[PDB]
Structure formats: structure tokens, C-alpha cells
Symmetry: D4
Subunit: 242 residues, 8 copies
């Protein structure tokens, strides 16, 4: 199957927000990424508007040349913005104000009715919803039951592995989890913590549809520039698939 | 005695600390900068270690090919770190309403004793001290008395000007402060808020010795790569001087 | 004695509008140009919206990192648009709604009343007005007489000169006129028809403040890319001022 | 099974024709494209000469290093010019602006006689003919009847698809049509609204011989330069093929 | 005064004529050069057409964006062609026993009547005529006598000098010759043999108006490409004149 | 198995010899080529020393990092030079094309005695011999009979094919000759007239071991530079084969 | 199976140590290489510290983004350093006569007890050990029984093979060895002497896990820059595995 | 006022000799440097042939496009080599303990007889000799009397300066020594230990004719490639001078 790359540009905004300036502008990064290998642009509108802001999402929706993937918390505030913005994709993730980044996966089991109503509301607006969960068989079953067509498997543990043996374990865990998801008719994506040195093993998973990568790309971009950083990532991914 | 460029790489660490990673590494950025037009490297070690860390300071002191400029608040902890680190340059600045003036500069005038002790503490360790203050006569005089060899004029107001008239007014303030400081035997630097579109007017000021710019350069770097970002700024500065 | 470059991106929209597509997007070009030597971005909102659209002006006002220069004809429609848009600059030009390009030369002396009202309404919105006129003393006096702080001398005749004698005469005319406008306290810009082979002669004119160039740059850009096209133009202008 | 790229440079003339200038010159673009991945150069000489002119065709025939594909309307004037110019390939299409012949594609089945005589007059001049038509069973059978060896499927509907579902439906219609066309002994091409984001699915169609793409490449070119724009499209195409 | 660069593309043709193929095409070389520092293109149409052919001149006259400098022998055939092609510049060169031993500049003094008619016939066509002659008193005096507006000093002996003393002596000659020609109301050009390592001394000569360099540029181009080759030469020239 | 690229740098010398200078130096071109895709370097030392000279062969044998392929005519002088030079390969070719040694490729069948001695003489010196011949049954068998290790099929007729039908025939005639030569235990190479647009069909023939290309690459280089030219050609070859 | 590239930066230090300078700094080379294709960085800390020094190791352990591979002799000093440094990998090499075989690999079979102790000590510290040995069916057995999970085949003889016959003979030797090593459960690496012209045949060996290359890459870097040098080598390797 | 750059490529050989390979080849480096800003190439033939070898000098004398500057000690072996090689320039340097001074320069004053001879012998061979001495008045006087036309001041001390005051002091010495040398009729050069960060102060010295730099450039080259390394240094030099 084909492998797509979704560039998350949140960290361009984390750099802008460090100061009250307008640069660097996520709108510019979007254009560069979309013309360098990005098949879609992902932004996570946090309730504390830590990096990406409402302004960014509003403009991006009008300038993006590819489909927008809006990552957000499952709250009334975000559900409302999502419906009005009508992005092509919507990835629901867990969120906390004092968190460094998206922690574990989203709890779909012990929160079924909440996720059921969310998927339906977004679906009515014409948005394809993806659920960001761990490589957990129980979480996978829920996602498929709440009505979500997509699920994004958290790869943070995989990328955080200390030893080669622990990494192999997380990798096998993800792969299996991805295989089962597919049997349930779920389309599977992955993301979080993927770098230039560990993306290939993940891109190798046949079931994987799109990888959403942000931090590693932006981290690389400050050195070589966004174009080469994105092109580099896409190439590695295609080499792993083919 | 032309115009030098000091590149502040704090925002490299800003991007890194955003996540729990080691990249991008300020150590790599320094090499790039030093070979693209930087005549020195600036790093601000904050009390909260927001971006630059002790590790960063410790390693950079061993890898820098050019002179190091340590930006820090006037505290015993920091003075101690500076004496141990022995950076070529040290710039004293206020940290979170710790001893700051309305405009944002260090209050040297109302803290002569504390500054006298710090400048001597650092001068005796072979460090050349600069005081970050507003383009103010009173502050300039106090910097001269305290013993500081350098002063770095706060150009944030000029950089934040909302109209051409306000910008022109701030420019004139700086130009006058630069000349007054020089008549007092001080060498004058500037920076903070400088961008690719307002840097020339400051670089044209005859008294300016070195400009320490960070945010705008890192801002451009995420798009164009650090090498072109640094080379660009340096060319603008030399065009304005020559 | 600094010489600025205003980049007119109208022809980016020309290529876009040739189809119902959204690419190439002027928003992208603006970032590229602004970081490659553009000191400002110019867009001409034609009544027929042949290239630049209302959407363009609206998004650009929000994404430009440099000042916006809004070129438009003198009509209630455009005056209202400019007032709510609050661009930094506004250049008033003659428009036929069917012309190939600005026929060059706004009749200010022949429309005193209308122009006087236009200049005041725009200035009341904090917009610095520039009148696009011919290198004619009467039209220029009329420009400063109606309030306009800026003027942009039409360089099309100079660019279209068919013989050396005709070209040198038109160059002398523009220069003579520039000096004249300056003695009136006016700020003088120039544009239309400037290319990589005739710009130097205009850049050399001491009184010139900003040159607005569009077509020649975009024409170069399709071959070499917008960044090098803009950088090339800016370098030639500065060399001429040297 | 080889997949070829035909670069249509009409829009280069579009940018030129915005003024009475000679630049940008289609002649230059041709060389750049042929050396960056173009296997042929395509030009559409419109009755109104909207972009490509008689001068362009005449000079290109003498400067092209590859093969020229002359896209034209089935008129006496064009057929005459085609025989005069003697391009390697000829692609017959409905009028421009907003067409004359029902739909986006050419009505071969409806003007069986006109085309039949057009294909023979051209084939006798040593020119290989292609008929631009919609993905339609009847239209194809008609193309085989009139004797045209080539056909080019209108990918416009596929490119304009507003939803994924709609796009996949159009893609399947194209694939089925292409397979059916080859069964009639016809060689099949395509490419009308093809872009960097939708080209792969088309290039992946086994029967496709050459994709003729113009607008997207030119729109990308104004940003990155023609060379990279053409090389980028060619790379994506071969990736989808092999 | 400013210094102009005239790029001779003859050796592009020599490369092509070696295989009698179509590439490399001088027409392509012209675009690249004109967009990288060339203020004009020079082509020598030999009667035997060793390199540049009739076809070359014919197309070039239609594609050049700058100005053509037709170098040719003083023959009725050549005169009739220059009058028809109507190049902006024309440089008369020797092809038979019209030379002056080594450092074979055109023999004007010995062919006063022939040159006189040539200059008058071409001038009536509005073609600026230049006489390629060696740095000789009498040859320079005859040039102004026959009415030639321009003269081009043969710097071949200077370029081939083996020792510093030899080169210095030749450089002095040229300098005296240029100054002497300027007094006679003559405009002076140079070229032939100039390289990246000896052009500055020539460009530093105040009287020099345009340098027409060819072979060194193309020889450089084969390694680094035309664009850079032309830009490098142009930069060296402007640095010298500075 | 794999396909190799041999770059003939003869035309670098053509451009140099055009004048009496030492640039462009084939020695430089060789390094560039060997580092951009060339797996060997080829030079044809003509008896008339038209381009490549004795100096060139002498220094190249000392500077080449890859195997040297010496193309020469069958004569005592050349045989003596080859034996002394000890290139890794030696390609025998007809010279002057107006003798009883040429008919297209080398006439081995008609000079069986001369070739037998040549192959033995060169093989004894540890040189791998290649006979440049047409895709002719008689010549191919004769090459193997004479003991030559390699043969190089003359791809000229294929490169000169006027029509698509003609080129198809020639391609088939080559493909057939290749398989036939491989069955006789001979290694088959090819070259001459191959360009960036017709090289793939040849590189696709499984039997081909190494393609030796000269003119096309140098013709591209004058525009794009040698590195690019060679890398481009190698990538195309590997795409067609691997 | 995946093929990894280990870049040995020792010769960067070779250049530095040639002078008492601090540049070129291995630390900078490591960042470059890790982002241009390196899956790991290799440094040989010699007892004499001829190039890489103790500080290089200490700093690199803290700046490397990938995995460190520490080449060292089997001594108490180095074992203590390795344990303290905790590199991901450790490759044992001969540095004295008594430790080397005639071919150049480490004499493992001759020092069973010593290597057994070494491997256990490093293994307990969490370090994966590799033994640099000859393609010998005795040293290989010794490597297994000693506990080393990895071995690195000395490809020095293969790198020196000049004739096709010698290359084939040495290659076959490495291949059989690799296959034998694998049958014993050993992981097999290679390198040493490998170049841009001989790396493919080795990379094509199925069992090869990682190639550690150094001098050839650095030698290319001085010409092209490290980034391109590393990328080129990585691309050639991956191509061999396709 | 003209400032030249002599690139010393010894360290290219240093890297090569470390493995005994043929690469990187000094001959290639020379072409790169001469085309990137080098006005000459310097090679130090060490008696022990530590880096540059006899073959290097032999080939270089034949491939250099510019002028050779052979650095060597004063010995019958080297004198003979110099006269046989015919380098444009010869720089006499110390290599034995009894030849070096306290600072590191050549002891001309102490060996006036040995130098007087060496200078005449070389001068008769047509070689311009330079004496590498410290910034010492006594050593300078001996240089003029001995007959040497050039002298190269040892900038080593200036480069190894430990403090700002210490460095400014060394700079004054050299600047005073350069002026003094000039009053004696001695042409003056310098270069040793010069880097991208300390060359300007030296280049600014009016008397300087040519700077011979090596290690700093090759150390930069390994990171960025020789072309940019040479180009960068040349630009910095011209910037300091004009
Ligand atoms: C891809 C995703 O859903 C996230 O896990 C990721 O960590 C986002 O991080 P930021 O919120 O810092 O962009
Ligand atoms: C302008 C810039 O980048 C800095 O110079 C400035 O001092 C930043 O300080 P912080 O890194 O504490 O925001
Ligand atoms: C510079 C200016 O104001 C214009 O005159 C120019 O001709 C604009 O042309 P477009 O309206 O085609 O951009
Ligand atoms: C997609 C493209 O660029 C063209 O192929 C298309 O035929 C354009 O036609 P016009 O140039 O008539 O718009
Ligand atoms: C130096 C150069 O390239 C030429 O200017 C010169 O006139 C060449 O003449 P030919 O092309 O007749 O050798
Ligand atoms: C195609 C090419 O460049 C050559 O291979 C060919 O052998 C050239 O021969 P000459 O250099 O004798 O024309």
C-alpha cells in the first residue's frame, strides 16, 4: 500500500510563541512542507494555545493545498471549532495543561459514550475522525465500536525505548496491534516520537496508512531548512515501504 | 574596528526542551553559525534553565571555535558558574522582574554596589563584562562607574515600534545613547528584537561594536537553514556599515 | 540614502487565475520575497479582480511580515476596502478595467477635489498615500498639493525607450522630476517596466526611496525560482547605489 | 511499460502575454524542461493566441531537442499549420476559454467524419495523432474508428473531485477506460489537471504511456524554478510506475 | 564609468559542430548568460561558419533579451547580413590577409577605404560599429579617421604573457592605447584571451566600456556550469572597476 | 548484472584545443566525473591528436582513480603507446572513415590477422581489449575468434534513427547482437551517440556491461556543469537497468 | 535485511592533530554525518591517541544522536574507558604486532582467554562487541566461542584487488566467510578500505549488517563537503540492496 | 592595493598519506582552489615528504592553471629541485633545529652567506624568492641585503595570541614590520595560522601583497567542500582590503 506523510508544524509555532513576534509563521512552513513531500499538514490546537493558535488554524484552512489534520482534545470547545473549520481530518487526543506533550493514548474504553457523540458530530460536518490510542487490543476494539474510521497508534514508547530489546518489543506490539485494527476495518496511522533513525521500522508495517511526524522534522529543519528536512523524511519512508 | 555578529542560540534549545529530546543540539548550531558569519556565540543560562542548560554551557565551552558570550542574571550562583566557565564575554541581564526597569533594561543605577561586585568578580576571572541597559543617560553613567567595559543597548523598543515615526524616534534615542556611552569610555553593543528588516539602521550606528541577535535568525533558520540565516544577517550588517 | 525594494506579486495570481486552481498562491510568494530582499510587498486589487483577489488582500494583510503596499484605482469601492484593510501604504493609480497594465500617469491636477478627499480619508486611517504619476512638475505639485506624502514616478516610458537617445532623455526626465518632487518634501519611489537590465540607472537616482518591481521578477522566477529572482534584483539595486 | 512526461509550457506564455514583453520566453523553458525530466514539450496554439503564439511554435520547432506535441483545435487553419510545422505528435482538443464541443473532452463519436479526415491528413504528414477525450466507452470506440493511434484521457474530473470517495470513483473510471482503450489497439495518455498530489494514482495506471502536465509544474516553478519543478514531477511519476 | 560584460558563445557552437548534432544549443547558452551577468551576447559569424551558423544568428536575433554584437569579416556578404539582422553592435574582425602579423588586429590603416564604407553603411543602418584592432597608434588613429565609434583592443598578447614583466609591458601598452583612443573621441572595448585570473587589470582601465569574453567562460562552464561561470566573471569585473 | 558508466572526456579537450590554452583541462574533468557516477574514464588518442593529446594520456594514467579505457586505431605507434601506458582497457576503433579499416565499426572480419596480433600484443601487456564494431553477425564472431575479451556495439545508427520505426529496428538489431555476443562468451559494451533521451532503451538490454558516453554528457555540462551531467546520466542508466 | 552505514570520523582528527588547532572538530563531523545517512558514528581511540583523543570520546558520547561504536585495542586501559563511556558498540582491533595476523585482522584464535575476558567484561557493561577479523574459517570460530555477538570482516584485501579476477576472488572469499559467520549465529559487519567504487559488491552481501567506512568518505569530503560525501556512500549501499 | 590569496594544499596530502591511498589527490584540490579564489597554489616539499611528495610537485607543475609557490628548506637537494621545477615562486623556510629561530621563522641574519647564494641561484633560474621570517627588524634588514625580493611574515604568534591585548600587540608588530620591510623595498606576504576569524586584521595591512593560508581552509573544506572554503576566505580578504 501507499505510505503518506503528515507534517505536524506545531513546533514552528512553539518557536514563534517564545516571543510575541509573528515569525516564524506556520503558514509559510505549510507551503514548504506541502511542496517537499508532505501529503497533509497536521496542527494540534491546544486549549492553552501553547503553540498553534486559532489564528493559525483559521488561515491554514484557507491556504493549505493539501488536507488539514486537526489534532485536538475531546472537549465542547474543540468540537465546536472543528465543526466550523471543517478540516479533512480530525485526530482526537488526550490533553492536559501541564503536560510536555501528548502522553499515553486516548481512553476510548472507559469513555465510550463521550467518543461516540464526538465521532458522530464531526462526521456530520464531513470530517474523517482518527483516534489516537496506544497499541492496546482493548482500545482498538473500542475505536471501531464508537464509529471512528481511523486510529493513530502512539509510537512514543517505541521511540523512547532505552535498549534494543525493549524497542523490538514495542515494535512487535505496534505491528500486531496494527494488524488487528485492520481486521476490524480500521484504517491505521502512527505518530509521535518518530525520528530520522527509527522511522523505517514503523514505515515497514504494511497496515500503516500515514505517519504524522512533527518534532523531529522541525528539529532537523532549524539546521538544514524545512524543505530538505521534509524531503529527507519522505524519502526514508518510501524506501522502507518499497 | 568594524561590526561583529554574535549569534544567540537559546531558541535552538527552546525547540529541543519543548519535547523530551536531545535534538536539535545547540552544540551543532554553534558550529554552523561560527562558520556562516558569526564572530561569537551567545547563550543565556536562565535560573529556570528554560532553554540553555548547564550541560549546554559546559560542552559549548569546549567546542566553540570563537568567543563565548554568557548571558546571565546577577546572582551568586551565576557569578560562580561564570568564573568556573571563564567565558570570553559575559552579559548581565534581569530575570523575571528581578531587577529590571520599565523598558526592560538592567537597573544598574539603583544597584551600583551589587553591580560593582559582579563586574569585579568577573573581570578578575578574565571575563569582559557587558551590562544590558536601556538607552538612558543615567543608566549609562552608572555602567561606566561600576567598571563595566561594555554595555548592550536594549533595542526591543525600537524593534517593537508600531509606526515609522515611533521607529525613527527610538532609533535616534539609541544613536544618542551610543555616542554618550562612547564619550564615557564604554564600548557599545546592541541586539534583542533585531530582524532582517530593521537591523541595518542599527548596524549603521558608528559606535556599535557587536550585535547579538538570536530569535530572528533561528526564526529564519527553520525555513532556510541556519547557514543561510546567519550568512544573510551578517551580509546585511556589513552592507550597512560599509 | 537607503534604497528599498517593493515586490509586486500580482503576476503570481495571474498564473493562478489562469485556472480555477488555488496555486500558485500569492501568500507563498510573499514569504519567499520578504525573506529574499523584499522590503515590502505590493499587490494591485483591480476592479475586475483579474489577478489579485479580495481573499488575497485579506490574507496577505495578516501574513505579510513587512509593510503592505495596496495599489488601487480611486473609487468609493477601493477607498472603503483600503480603509478596513489598513495597509501601511496605498498607491493610487489610473485603471481602465480592460487595460493590459497601468497606462501610467494618474491625473492628479485634473482631479484635484477627488484626490484631495481620497488622500485625507486614507491618511485618517493611518495609511501613507502614494500617487502614481508621470515625471511632470505640474502633476507632482498637484500631488503634494492634495496631501499625498509619497509619489511613484512612472518608469514605463524609460523602460520602453526604443533608442539610446530616447532612453537617456527619459532617464534625465525621471531624475530631474525626482529632484523636483524632493524639494517639495515628497518621498519618491519609481516603478513599472524595470528589469534586470535597466534598473541600475533608476537605482542610481539619489532621491529614489523605494522601487516597486513585479513582472520582470516573476518572469525571472519561473526560470530560477522566486528567491534568487528577488535576491538578484535587490543586489543590482544596491550595487547601483554603492 | 515506460512512463513518459510531456511538459506543457503554455502558461509560461501566459505570464509573458500579461505584458507586451518577450520574457519569460517559452523557448528558454523548453530547454530547461527537456533537461530536467521532460520527454517531450507540449504547446497549445489557441485560435485567439491567448498564450502560445505563432512565433513560439516556429522557433520551438527549430530549438526543441525532444519531440513537440502540438495541441490544437480541428480547424482548417490549425491542420494547415500542423502540416507546415510537422510536429512529432498532435493532440486534437475542443476550443479553449470555455470550449465549443460539448464537455471538456472532444466529441469524436459525434463528429466521426470531421475527425476521421483530420486524423488522415495529419497521419499523411508523418504526424502521430492523439484525441483528447473523456473516460467514456463510446468516445473511445470512436477514437479507434477514426484511426487515431493515440488518445489522451481527460483527468480534469479526477483532479477536481471534492471528496475522497468522488476522487476514487473518477480514478476507477479512468483505469477501466484506459484498459478498454488498449484492447482496441490504442495507446493511452492523460494529464490535464494533474498535480504533485494526484499524479501518482494516474501514473500507476499500467496502460498510461505519457502524462502531459503543464499548469501545476509552472505554478510550482514560479516558486522553485522550472528545473526542480519538472524533476520533481518526473520522479513522482517513475516512483508510481516501477 | 560602469563596465559591461559581453559574453561570446561561439565555443558553445564549436562543441556542437564537433558532432554536428543539435546540442549544445547557443540559443540556450544566451538565456543563461543574459540572466547571470551578461549585458550582451557576442557571436562571430565566420564566412566558413566553423562554429556559429546562419541559423544561430537568425534565431538568436529573435530570442535575445539583451543586445547582439555580431562579429564578422568586412565582406559584402557579411555587410548585407548585418544590415538585415540589424544587431545593436557589430565588431569587424580579420579573416584573411586583413590581419597584422601576430596580435592580428584588423588592418584598418592599410584598408582605410574599405573600413570607411563599412562603418558608413552599417551606421546608416543604426548599427554601432567596433573595429577589433591591436593596441597600435596608427591603427587607432585610422579607426577614428574612418569614422568608427568603437574600437576593441586585442588583449591576446597580454593574456598569453608568460612572465610578470612581459604581462606588465603588455598591460602598459593597452593602458596607453585606451587613453590615447579616448582622446580621439573613441569608445574602447577589450576582450579575447581574458581569463578569471587576468581580467581585473583590464577591467581596472578607466576607458574600458565593455569586455567581450568567451573562451575562458565556456571552459569554466564545462566544469561548474554556465550560470556560475558568467556570474563569477561579472563579479570579478565589477570588483576591479570598483 | 550491473551496468557501468564510462565517461569519454574527449570533448573537454576539443574545447581546450579550440584555443591554445591549457583549460579546460581533461585532468580536472576526470576527477569530477569519477566522483559523480563514472566507473571509468575514456579518451581516444587520435593519430592527428585532434583533442586528447599524449600529455593528456600520460597525466591521466597517473591521476585517474578509476580504470582508464584508451580508444585508439590499430597501428604500431598506438600499440606501442598502449603497451607502455598500460591502461586497464583498450578499445580499437577505425580512424578517418575513408579507408579499408572502416565501414561503420571496426572491420575485424576483413583484418583477422591484424586484429589477432593486436589482441595478443595488448593482452600480453595485461590489457583488456574491446573491439568497436557494428551489430553485425560476421564482425561479432570475428571479434571472439580474434580473442578480444569485450566488444563495443556501434549505437550510432540507433542514435541517428530519423523515425520511431527506424529506431525500433536498430534497437532490435542491437538487442539481438548483444545476446549473440554473450553466447560467444563475449562481454558487450556500447556507446557513441547516446543521449539523455535514448540511453534507457540501451541500458535496458541485459547483456550490456558498460556504456561509454562522451559528447552528450559534455554538451549537457556546458549548461549544468559536469558533476550534474554525469550524475544525471548514471541515474537514468540505473533506472532502466536495476 | 536492512543495511546500515557506520561513519568513522578518525581522519577528521587526523587533519586537526596535524596542528595544535581545535578544528576540524570531530564533534561537528558527527552531527553532519548523522544527518546525511550515518546510522552510527565510529571513532578509534588509539593507545597513542594519534587522531581521536580522550576528550573527543568524552564529548562525542554526550553529543551523538545515534549510537557510538568505539574501536580500541584489547587492554586494561581501554576496557576501563569503554566501561566508563558505555558506547552502544565496541569493536576490538589490533594495534600491536603480537595482536595482529599476517592479513591484518585481530588474532582472536591466538588469544582466546584474553578475548573471552574482554567480551564478557564489555557485555556486562551493556556493550555489544564486535571483533575485527580476517575472512578466516578459524578466527570466525574463535569469535563465536569467545562470546562476541558481532564480527567485522577485514575487507582490506578486497579493496586492494585490481583485476576483475582478483576482485572476484577476494569478494567470493568475503562472501563465503559472511555466510559461514551467520551459520554460527554471528552478526557480520565490514568496512576498512571500502570506496565509492567497490562498496556495492560488499553491500550486496546478504549477511552484511553494517558497513563501517571512514577514510574514503573523509577523502571525498575535502572535495565535496561531508554531507554529500556521506549521502553518496549511503545511496550507493542502499542501491546495492535492491 | 590588490590582495592575493595563495592556497596551501599540503593537508590534502596529509589526509591522503594517512592511508597511503591515491585520494584525496592534491591535483584535484588545486583545480578547485584556482577556480574558487586562489591566485596561486602553495605546496611545501618537506625533506621527509610528510605530505606533499615529489610526484605531487611533478604533476602539479604540469596541471596548475595559475602559478606555483614551492615552500622548502635551503638544501642542495631542494635548490636543485627548485631549479628543475621552475616554480613561479619559492618560499624558503626552516626545517632543522639549527635553522629555526625562537619565534619560528627562518634565520637569515645568522646564515647570510647561505641565503645570499640560495637567492642568487633561484633568481638565475627565473624564480621569485620569498623569505619566511618573524616580525623582526634584524631579520628584515638581512632579507633586503641578501637580495630576496619577497618576505613572508610569520603570523603564527599573532594567531596563537592568548588574550585580546596580546593579539593586538602581535598585530602591531607585524603591521610595523610590514611597513618597515616596504621601506626597504621588500614586497611583503604573510600567512600561517590565519583563520576565518583572524585574517581580516592581517589582510587590512596595506603592505600585504599575498596571504598564503592552508590548514584553516582545508579544515573548513572537510565540512563544506573546498570550493566554498576557498571562496569564503577570498571574500573575507577582499572585504578587509576594500
Ligand atoms: C502526533 C501527536 O498526536 C502528538 O503525539 C505529538 O506529540 C504532538 O506534539 P505537540 O502537541 O508538541 O505538537
Ligand atoms: C533576540 C534574542 O534571540 C535574544 O537575544 C534574547 O536575549 C533572547 O533571550 P531569551 O533566550 O531569554 O528569550
Ligand atoms: C508598478 C505599478 O504600480 C504598476 O504600474 C504596474 O504596471 C502594475 O502592473 P500589474 O497591475 O500588471 O501588476
Ligand atoms: C494542465 C496544463 O497545463 C495544460 O495541459 C492544459 O492543456 C492547458 O491548456 P491551456 O494552456 O489552453 O489552459
Ligand atoms: C575570447 C573568445 O572567446 C572570443 O572572443 C574570440 O573572438 C573567439 O573567436 P573565435 O570564436 O573565432 O575563436
Ligand atoms: C560519443 C562520444 O563522445 C565518443 O564516445 C566518441 O568516441 C567520440 O570520438 P571522438 O572524440 O574521436 O569524436
Amino acid at each position: 500500500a501507499e505510505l503518506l506523510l503528515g507534517v505536524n508544524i506545531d513546533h514552528i509555532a512553539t518557536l514563534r510563541n517564545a516571543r510575541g513576534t509573528a515569525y516564524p509563521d506556520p503558514v509559510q512552513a505549510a507551503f514548504i512542507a506541502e511542496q517537499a513531500g508532505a501529503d497533509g499538514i497536521t496542527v494540534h490546537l491546544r486549549e492553552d494555545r501553547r503553540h498553534i493558535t486559532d489564528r493559525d488554524v483559521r488561515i491554514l484552512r484557507q491556504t493549505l493545498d493539501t488536507r488539514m489534520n486537526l489534532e485536538m482534545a475531546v472537549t465542547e470547545e474543540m468540537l465546536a471549532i472543528a465543526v466550523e473549520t471543517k478540516p479533512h481530518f480530525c485526530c482526537l487526543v488526550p490533553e492536559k495543561r501541564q503536560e510536555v506533550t501528548t502522553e499515553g493514548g486516548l481512553d476510548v474504553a472507559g469513555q465510550r459514550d463521550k467518543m461516540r457523540d464526538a465521532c458522530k458530530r464531526l462526521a456530520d460536518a464531513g470530517i474523517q475522525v482518527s483516534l489516537f490510542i496506544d497499541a492496546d487490543e482493548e482500545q482498538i476494539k473500542a475505536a471501531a465500536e464508537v464509529g471512528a474510521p481511523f486510529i493513530e497508534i502512539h509510537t512514543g514508547c517505541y521511540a523512547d525505548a532505552k535498549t534494543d530489546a525493549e524497542q523490538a518489543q514495542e515494535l512487535a506490539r505496534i505491528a500486531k496491534a496494527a494488524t488487528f485494527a485492520a481486521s476490524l476495518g480500521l484504517k491505521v496511522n502512527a505518530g509521535h516520537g518518530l525520528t530520522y533513525h527509527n522511522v523505517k521500522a514503523i514505515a515497514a508495517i504494511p497496515e500503516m496508512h500515514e505517519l504524522n511526524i512533527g518534532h523531529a522534522i522541525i528539529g532537523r529543519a532549524v539546521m538544514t531548512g524545512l524543505k530538505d528536512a521534509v524531503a529527507e523524511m519522505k524519502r526514508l519512508m518510501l524506501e522502507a515501504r518499497g
